[PDB]
Symmetry: D2
Subunit: 113 residues, 4 copies
């Protein structure tokens, strides 16, 4: 709304709760990143209100998931210290859902609406 | 050996050929990434000779897949301009396989050996 | 409610619309599968009304997805003529989400709720 | 050769060893399945000798992975008592690799070679 996520712990068949997510946007002129917001997934593994419609401008975004910290808080290690999903937003009339299905040794993502 | 990849175009059920892959390593001390190697996947979607045993030391690595340029060359667009998989190497006795299963609107990876 | 699905065409980045889905349940003792409900996905790739809470008993269920016919209607072939996901329900106090993430040459599913 | 598989336990990031696999092929006049071969994956998670080149005719095949029995022999429960992958072979000149990425609550499959 207009950007949502869902973190899923597919090793346990439950949502990934309390994972830190940091949203960034690429600066159009330099190659650098602006932090837009930092969230934490709720018990349903979601992060409501990541961005407002007015600030969700077209461009290139990056969602960093703190997978290493998540798994560590469950007392286990992860192959990935963090996961960054980088994606292009051009059509701003649509909803964009960028989930993360995660184990300690795998991850997947897809574009949802 | 000891780091390998495999790009799979799961939209067409064929390997991802001619995709640029760049391997980086995080430098202990400075919080900077530095390029170790660049490669281009062959027809089987693999990139032999990414790194030698002597240089495959423990640390944090990142493999950047140019998914945007790959799909642009197939005359299609990608949700992801590029994919970076960041991973921790501590046990240097093992072989690490870091594949990319890719469509225009999704991707996934797992730790293989 | 209490069983749902979600079909996502990850090759095209859109919900899987108008896919026929059939829920079956295995009759304990006999080896007999029989139809519980036949449905079709709506515009958002979802299929409400799969089973009533009253009829949601512990047992083995199977959701059959007509992927071949789905792709055929899109003018493309599928590697899988249909997909059956078989699962065991023992805890009838929960909601079970059984999505299907589909391309022409791949699929995945996970337990959600 | 010409049909192969690879089972990966992505929950633990090791190969799916000692899993029972059953290959069937659909009888093209009745709508019923003929058992071709039953095998067990090796320590690498693979299962060589699934079918001979001679017996590899065009048709509909089905690979049943006994996931529930895999997990139980490991002291764990699986949401799926088994996984069957049904696929159409039309081009008999190609090799078909159909691996299974598995956890207790998720699985995915894709065409390779």
């Amino acid at each position: 709304s207009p950007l949502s996520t869902h973190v899923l712990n597919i090793a346990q068949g439950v949502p990934g709760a309390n994972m830190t997510i940091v949203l960034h946007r690429l600066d159009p002129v330099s190659s650098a990143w602006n932090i837009l917001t930092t969230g934490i997934t709720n018990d349903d593994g979601r992060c409501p209100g990541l961005i407002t419609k007015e600030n969700f401008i077209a461009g290139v975004y990056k969602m960093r998931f703190e997978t290493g910290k998540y798994w560590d808080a469950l007392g286990e290690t992860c192959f990935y210290p963090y996961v960054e999903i980088v994606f292009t937003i051009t059509n701003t009339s649509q909803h964009y859902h960028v989930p993360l299905l995660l184990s300690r040794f795998s991850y997947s993502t897809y574009r949802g609406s």
